[PDB]
Protein backbone atom coordinates (compact mmCIF):
# COMPACT_ATOMS: atom_id res chain seq x y z
CA UNK A 1 0.00 0.00 0.00
CA UNK A 2 0.86 3.86 -0.40
CA UNK A 3 -0.25 7.12 1.07
CA UNK A 4 0.22 10.54 -0.20
CA UNK A 5 -0.76 13.66 1.55
CA UNK A 6 -0.54 17.43 0.84
CA UNK A 7 1.03 19.66 3.77
CA UNK A 8 0.82 23.43 4.04
CA UNK A 9 2.50 25.36 5.97
CA UNK A 10 0.16 27.40 8.73
CA UNK A 11 1.19 31.35 8.37
CA UNK A 12 3.34 33.63 6.06
CA UNK A 13 6.34 32.24 8.11
CA UNK A 14 6.16 28.69 7.43
CA UNK A 15 6.47 28.05 11.35
CA UNK A 16 5.18 24.76 10.90
CA UNK A 17 3.05 22.62 8.29
CA UNK A 18 -0.27 21.10 9.14
CA UNK A 19 -1.28 17.47 7.54
CA UNK A 20 -4.83 16.70 7.31
CA UNK A 21 -5.44 12.96 8.94
CA UNK A 22 -8.31 10.93 9.28
CA UNK A 23 -9.23 9.57 12.63
CA UNK A 24 -12.07 7.08 13.52
CA UNK A 25 -15.50 6.20 12.22
CA UNK A 26 -17.16 8.15 10.41
CA UNK A 27 -13.95 9.89 9.66
CA UNK A 28 -12.84 12.87 11.77
CA UNK A 29 -10.45 15.18 9.91
CA UNK A 30 -7.57 17.07 11.85
CA UNK A 31 -4.97 19.02 10.56
CA UNK A 32 -1.82 17.15 12.90
CA UNK A 33 1.55 18.48 12.93
CA UNK A 34 3.91 15.89 10.90
CA UNK A 35 7.10 15.79 13.41
CA UNK A 36 9.76 13.85 12.83
CA UNK A 37 11.53 14.47 15.93
CA UNK A 38 8.85 13.19 18.21
CA UNK A 39 7.15 9.40 18.23
CA UNK A 40 3.60 10.29 20.00
CA UNK A 41 0.14 10.85 17.58
CA UNK A 42 -1.51 12.92 19.84
CA UNK A 43 -4.59 15.32 19.18
CA UNK A 44 -6.70 17.94 20.92
CA UNK A 45 -10.06 16.32 22.03
CA UNK A 46 -13.31 16.06 23.52
CA UNK A 47 -11.44 15.36 26.78
CA UNK A 48 -9.23 18.70 26.67
CA UNK A 49 -9.47 21.37 29.01
CA UNK A 50 -12.20 23.57 27.91
CA UNK A 51 -10.44 26.68 28.70
CA UNK A 52 -7.32 25.30 26.94
CA UNK A 53 -9.33 25.07 23.52
CA UNK A 54 -9.33 28.65 21.10
CA UNK A 55 -10.44 27.19 18.03
CA UNK A 56 -9.03 23.57 17.25
CA UNK A 57 -10.80 21.12 15.84
CA UNK A 58 -11.28 18.40 18.42
CA UNK A 59 -11.16 14.32 18.55
CA UNK A 60 -14.02 13.00 19.81
CA UNK A 61 -13.86 9.50 20.26
CA UNK A 62 -17.32 8.70 21.80
CA UNK A 63 -18.62 9.37 17.84
CA UNK A 64 -16.25 7.15 16.78
CA UNK A 65 -17.60 3.40 16.77
CA UNK A 66 -14.32 2.55 16.19
CA UNK A 67 -12.52 4.10 19.04
CA UNK A 68 -11.74 1.47 22.11
CA UNK A 69 -10.41 2.99 25.25
CA UNK A 70 -6.94 1.61 25.79
CA UNK A 71 -7.46 1.08 29.56
CA UNK A 72 -5.31 2.05 32.23
CA UNK A 73 -2.34 3.98 29.65
CA UNK A 74 -1.84 8.13 29.93
CA UNK A 75 0.97 9.93 28.11
CA UNK A 76 3.22 12.75 28.86
CA UNK A 77 5.28 14.43 27.19
CA UNK A 78 7.65 18.26 26.78
CA UNK A 79 9.24 19.28 23.64
CA UNK A 80 12.18 21.56 22.99
CA UNK A 81 10.88 24.24 22.71
CA UNK A 82 9.35 24.12 26.40
CA UNK A 83 5.67 23.29 25.18
CA UNK A 84 3.54 20.06 26.98
CA UNK A 85 0.57 18.09 26.95
CA UNK A 86 -0.68 14.99 28.16
CA UNK A 87 -3.39 12.64 29.00
CA UNK A 88 -4.98 9.01 27.96
CA UNK A 89 -5.15 7.01 25.17
CA UNK A 90 -7.52 5.22 22.72
CA UNK A 91 -7.05 2.70 19.84
CA UNK A 92 -8.47 3.90 16.57
CA UNK A 93 -8.16 3.87 12.50
CA UNK A 94 -6.26 6.29 11.34
CA UNK A 95 -5.51 6.93 7.16
CA UNK A 96 -2.77 9.97 5.96
CA UNK A 97 -3.60 10.47 2.41
CA UNK A 98 -5.11 7.05 1.57
CA UNK A 99 -2.96 4.77 3.82
CA UNK A 100 -4.94 3.63 6.61
CA UNK A 101 -3.78 1.81 9.81
CA UNK A 102 -6.15 0.17 12.46
CA UNK A 103 -5.75 0.15 16.03
CA UNK A 104 -3.48 3.22 16.04
CA UNK A 105 -2.66 4.63 19.29
CA UNK A 106 -4.48 8.04 19.34
CA UNK A 107 -3.63 10.09 22.62
CA UNK A 108 -6.07 12.41 23.98
CA UNK A 109 -4.96 15.52 25.25
CA UNK A 110 -6.58 16.23 28.60
CA UNK A 111 -3.88 19.01 29.09
CA UNK A 112 -1.89 21.41 26.85
CA UNK A 113 0.33 24.05 27.33
CA UNK A 114 -0.35 27.63 26.23
CA UNK A 115 1.94 27.39 23.27
CA UNK A 116 -0.53 25.14 21.97
CA UNK A 117 -3.79 26.64 23.07
CA UNK A 118 -2.96 30.17 21.09
CA UNK A 119 -2.60 28.09 17.50
CA UNK A 120 -5.22 27.22 16.61
CA UNK A 121 -4.62 25.60 13.26
CA UNK A 122 -2.71 22.80 14.59
CA UNK A 123 -5.05 20.04 15.97
CA UNK A 124 -2.12 18.06 17.32
CA UNK A 125 1.49 16.16 16.58
CA UNK A 126 1.66 12.99 14.60
CA UNK A 127 5.16 11.49 15.31
CA UNK A 128 7.39 10.41 12.80
CA UNK A 129 10.42 9.44 14.92
CA UNK A 130 11.40 5.93 16.37
CA UNK A 131 8.94 4.70 18.23
CA UNK A 132 11.15 4.16 21.27
CA UNK A 133 10.61 7.42 22.06
CA UNK A 134 6.59 6.94 22.71
CA UNK A 135 5.88 8.22 26.18
CA UNK A 136 2.73 5.89 26.75
CA UNK A 137 2.71 4.40 29.80
CA UNK A 138 2.72 1.82 30.75
CA UNK A 139 2.60 -0.05 27.14
CA UNK A 140 4.81 1.94 25.20
CA UNK A 141 2.94 2.51 21.86
CA UNK A 142 4.00 2.72 18.13
CA UNK A 143 3.82 5.37 15.58
CA UNK A 144 1.68 5.71 12.88
CA UNK A 145 4.68 4.35 10.63
CA UNK A 146 5.67 1.82 12.12
CA UNK A 147 2.27 0.45 11.95
CA UNK A 148 2.31 1.13 8.86
CA UNK A 149 5.56 -0.39 7.36
CA UNK A 150 4.73 -4.16 6.69
CA UNK A 151 1.86 -3.09 4.80
CA UNK A 152 3.93 -0.27 2.76
CA UNK A 153 4.94 -1.28 -0.80
CA UNK A 154 8.78 0.08 0.64
CA UNK A 155 9.27 0.79 4.34
CA UNK A 156 9.90 4.47 3.73
CA UNK A 157 7.61 8.11 4.33
CA UNK A 158 9.58 11.36 2.25
CA UNK A 159 9.02 14.59 3.24
CA UNK A 160 9.09 17.36 0.57
CA UNK A 161 7.99 20.59 2.40
CA UNK A 162 7.35 24.18 0.19
CA UNK A 163 9.04 27.27 1.01
CA UNK A 164 5.50 29.85 1.41
CA UNK A 165 4.26 26.66 -0.62
CA UNK A 166 2.24 23.51 0.02
CA UNK A 167 4.01 20.72 -0.35
CA UNK A 168 3.77 16.75 0.54
CA UNK A 169 4.59 13.67 2.48
CA UNK A 170 4.40 10.16 0.50
CA UNK A 171 4.19 6.79 2.80
CA UNK A 172 5.46 3.48 0.97
CA UNK A 173 7.22 5.20 -2.06
CA UNK A 174 9.60 7.15 -3.67
CA UNK A 175 8.35 9.86 -6.63
CA UNK A 176 10.95 10.32 -9.12
CA UNK A 177 8.79 13.30 -10.69
CA UNK A 178 9.20 15.32 -7.21
CA UNK A 179 13.65 16.07 -7.30
CA UNK A 180 16.08 16.80 -9.41
CA UNK A 181 19.42 14.48 -9.51
CA UNK A 182 19.57 12.29 -7.74
CA UNK A 183 19.33 11.22 -4.04
CA UNK A 184 21.97 10.63 -1.41
CA UNK A 185 21.64 8.66 1.28
CA UNK A 186 23.74 8.77 4.31
CA UNK A 187 23.86 6.63 7.64
CA UNK A 188 21.44 6.89 10.72
CA UNK A 189 21.75 6.66 14.29
CA UNK A 190 18.88 5.54 16.29
CA UNK A 191 20.29 5.50 19.29
CA UNK A 192 19.00 8.69 20.79
CA UNK A 193 15.44 8.10 18.94
CA UNK A 194 15.73 10.28 16.33
CA UNK A 195 16.41 10.20 13.02
CA UNK A 196 19.81 11.59 13.87
CA UNK A 197 22.81 11.89 10.90
CA UNK A 198 26.35 13.71 9.99
CA UNK A 199 26.52 16.26 7.60
CA UNK A 200 30.00 16.63 6.06
CA UNK A 201 29.98 20.59 5.87
CA UNK A 202 28.49 24.02 5.09
CA UNK A 203 29.51 26.91 2.72
CA UNK A 204 28.14 30.35 3.24
CA UNK A 205 26.61 31.77 0.25
CA UNK A 206 29.28 31.45 -2.86
CA UNK A 207 31.96 30.82 0.06
CA UNK A 208 34.32 27.54 -0.41
CA UNK A 209 32.94 24.54 1.22
CA UNK A 210 34.28 23.72 4.92
CA UNK A 211 34.42 19.83 5.63
CA UNK A 212 33.32 19.10 9.13
CA UNK A 213 31.23 16.76 10.24
CA UNK A 214 28.14 18.06 12.23
CA UNK A 215 25.91 15.09 13.83
CA UNK A 216 22.33 16.50 13.99
CA UNK A 217 18.44 14.70 13.41
CA UNK A 218 15.75 15.44 11.00
CA UNK A 219 13.11 17.07 12.34
CA UNK A 220 9.88 18.29 10.47
CA UNK A 221 8.47 19.56 13.98
CA UNK A 222 11.22 22.27 14.33
CA UNK A 223 10.75 25.60 12.57
CA UNK A 224 14.66 26.61 11.98
CA UNK A 225 18.36 25.61 11.33
CA UNK A 226 20.30 25.24 14.84
CA UNK A 227 23.83 24.68 14.26
CA UNK A 228 27.12 25.41 16.41
CA UNK A 229 27.89 28.41 17.05
CA UNK A 230 31.10 28.57 15.10
CA UNK A 231 28.75 28.11 11.86
CA UNK A 232 26.46 30.19 12.71
CA UNK A 233 28.77 32.95 13.52
CA UNK A 234 30.13 32.66 10.53
CA UNK A 235 27.20 32.78 8.13
CA UNK A 236 25.74 35.96 9.54
CA UNK A 237 29.10 37.63 9.52
CA UNK A 238 28.28 38.05 6.16
CA UNK A 239 25.15 39.71 6.88
CA UNK A 240 25.61 43.43 7.44
CA UNK A 241 24.37 44.76 11.04
CA UNK A 242 23.36 41.03 12.12
CA UNK A 243 24.24 40.33 15.61
CA UNK A 244 22.94 37.54 18.98
CA UNK A 245 20.46 39.42 20.73
CA UNK A 246 19.91 38.10 24.18
CA UNK A 247 16.86 40.04 24.68
CA UNK A 248 14.93 38.96 21.81
CA UNK A 249 16.60 35.22 21.76
CA UNK A 250 18.73 34.71 18.79
CA UNK A 251 20.67 36.47 16.04
CA UNK A 252 18.65 39.45 14.35
CA UNK A 253 19.20 41.54 11.05
CA UNK A 254 18.27 44.75 9.52
CA UNK A 255 15.15 43.87 7.49
CA UNK A 256 16.67 45.51 4.75
CA UNK A 257 19.39 43.15 4.14
CA UNK A 258 20.15 40.72 1.40
CA UNK A 259 20.78 37.03 2.89
CA UNK A 260 23.26 34.80 1.33
CA UNK A 261 22.84 31.17 0.93
CA UNK A 262 24.04 28.60 3.22
CA UNK A 263 25.14 25.17 1.76
CA UNK A 264 25.07 22.11 3.87
CA UNK A 265 26.75 18.48 2.97
CA UNK A 266 25.33 15.28 2.43
CA UNK A 267 28.32 12.98 1.66
CA UNK A 268 29.51 14.27 -1.48
CA UNK A 269 26.66 16.16 -2.71
CA UNK A 270 25.48 19.51 -1.12
CA UNK A 271 22.08 21.35 -0.37
CA UNK A 272 21.42 24.84 -0.95
CA UNK A 273 19.09 26.75 0.79
CA UNK A 274 18.45 30.14 -0.72
CA UNK A 275 18.93 33.16 1.35
CA UNK A 276 14.91 34.00 1.67
CA UNK A 277 14.38 30.63 3.52
CA UNK A 278 16.41 32.18 6.06
CA UNK A 279 14.48 35.58 6.73
CA UNK A 280 11.64 35.13 9.47
CA UNK A 281 10.21 38.51 9.23
CA UNK A 282 10.18 41.15 11.88
CA UNK A 283 10.55 40.69 15.88
CA UNK A 284 7.75 42.26 15.89
CA UNK A 285 4.44 43.98 14.18
CA UNK A 286 6.20 46.79 12.43
CA UNK A 287 10.11 46.65 13.52
CA UNK A 288 13.19 46.89 10.87
CA UNK A 289 15.13 44.11 13.05
CA UNK A 290 14.66 40.77 11.72
CA UNK A 291 14.59 37.31 13.12
CA UNK A 292 16.94 34.68 11.43
CA UNK A 293 16.56 31.60 10.09
CA UNK A 294 19.60 29.93 11.56
CA UNK A 295 20.69 29.77 15.29
CA UNK A 296 23.16 28.60 17.70
CA UNK A 297 22.46 25.08 18.51
CA UNK A 298 24.58 25.70 21.95
CA UNK A 299 21.67 25.94 24.27
CA UNK A 300 19.84 23.17 22.63
CA UNK A 301 22.41 20.11 23.19
CA UNK A 302 21.71 18.66 19.90
CA UNK A 303 21.88 20.44 16.39
CA UNK A 304 18.77 20.35 14.32
CA UNK A 305 17.92 20.39 10.66
CA UNK A 306 14.62 22.17 10.83
CA UNK A 307 12.09 22.55 8.51
CA UNK A 308 14.46 25.90 7.37
CA UNK A 309 16.54 23.04 6.10
CA UNK A 310 14.39 20.36 5.11
CA UNK A 311 12.19 22.41 2.72
CA UNK A 312 15.03 23.34 0.17
CA UNK A 313 15.31 19.29 -0.30
CA UNK A 314 13.59 16.49 -1.05
CA UNK A 315 13.92 14.04 1.87
CA UNK A 316 13.69 10.42 2.36
CA UNK A 317 13.25 8.85 5.99
CA UNK A 318 14.38 5.04 5.00
CA UNK A 319 12.88 2.52 8.04
CA UNK A 320 14.55 -0.64 6.17
CA UNK A 321 16.05 -2.62 9.26
CA UNK A 322 18.99 -0.66 8.52
CA UNK A 323 17.68 3.09 8.52
CA UNK A 324 19.11 5.34 6.33
CA UNK A 325 17.98 8.78 5.39
CA UNK A 326 18.26 10.40 1.96
CA UNK A 327 18.57 13.89 0.57
CA UNK A 328 17.68 15.32 -2.90
CA UNK A 329 18.00 18.56 -4.76
CA UNK A 330 14.33 19.70 -6.04
Not at 14 to 39: C, E, M, R
Not at 89 to 112: F, H, M, P, R
Not at 241 to 250: E, L, N, R, Y
Amino acid sequence: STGSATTTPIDSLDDAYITPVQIGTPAQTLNLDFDTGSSDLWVFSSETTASEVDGQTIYTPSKSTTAKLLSGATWSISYGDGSSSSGDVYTDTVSVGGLTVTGQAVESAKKVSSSFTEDSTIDGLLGLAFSTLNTVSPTQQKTFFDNAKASLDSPVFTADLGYHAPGTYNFGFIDTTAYTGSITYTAVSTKQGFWEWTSTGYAVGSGTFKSTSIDGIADTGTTLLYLPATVVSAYWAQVSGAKSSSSVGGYVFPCSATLPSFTFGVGSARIVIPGDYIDFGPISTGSSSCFGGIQSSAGIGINIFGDVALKAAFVVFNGATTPTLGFASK
